[PDB]
Write a protein that binds this ligand. Structure first.
Ligand code: HEM
Ligand SMILES: [Ca+2]
Length: 173
């Protein structure tokens, strides 16, 4: 049930080119050994360490953001430590994060959204699970794991992340 939604200015962009611009604007939140605070942790909606959404804003520019949606839980110090797992079904990208407390997170100026991703991983796969690799890559400004997961969805339509948004819409609508 894969779907894409995009501002019409991105119709002629490849998926890869959009995500490359998004990543280079968002930068890298450096959520790493020795550098984690409240500033670069992001947050969940629906719980403190789990919920229907996870979202985070750029520490470089304070506005660029992404919202990950589905059913997600982070183990924090439970084994395997520091793993995000569960189901990742949507991702949205753009500028400005609001909500996240008594209402869901949303992006204030949305560029692109993917729905129906159907990505699922179990706790026991720890950091090798696809949902962990995708979202921790995004937090780090690395879209390599998401593109790999999108190529695996797209190959069934004969497309890839080198296809443009308009080419994907014509195959999926
Ligand atoms: C849900 C998305 C998240 C992912 C994918 C994630 C991923 C990670 C990873 C891979 C590490 C370990 C080692 C390293 O970064 O070099 C880590 C460390 C850590 N994370 Fe997260 N994290 C997430 C959210 C959070 C949140 C919401 C908190 C809240 C406090 C948090 C707190 C920490 C702490 C305290 C550490 C250890 C820092 C240290 O050992 O110096 N993480 N996280
Ligand atoms: Ca440490």
């Amino acid at each position: 049930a894969f779907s894409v939604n995009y501002d019409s200015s991105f119709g002629g962009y490849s998926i890869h080119d959009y995500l490359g611009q998004w990543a280079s604007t968002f930068g890298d939140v450096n959520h790493t050994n020795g550098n984690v605070t409240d500033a670069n942790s992001g947050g969940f909606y629906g719980g403190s360490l789990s919920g229907s959404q996870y979202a985070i804003s750029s520490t470089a520019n304070q506005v660029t953001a992404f919202v990950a949606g589905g059913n997600l839980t982070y183990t924090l110090f439970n084994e395997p430590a520091h793993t995000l797992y569960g189901q990742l079904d949507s991702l949205s990208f753009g500028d400005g994060l609001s909500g996240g407390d008594t209402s869901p997170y949303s992006i204030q100026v949305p560029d692109v959204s993917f729905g129906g991703l159907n990505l699922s991983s179990l706790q026991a796969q720890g950091h090798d699970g696809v949902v962990h690799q995708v979202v921790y890559g995004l937090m780090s400004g690395d879209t390599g794991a998401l593109e790999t997961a999108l190529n695996g969805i797209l190959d069934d339509y004969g497309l890839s992340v080198n296809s443009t948004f308009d080419q994907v819409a014509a195959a999926t609508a």
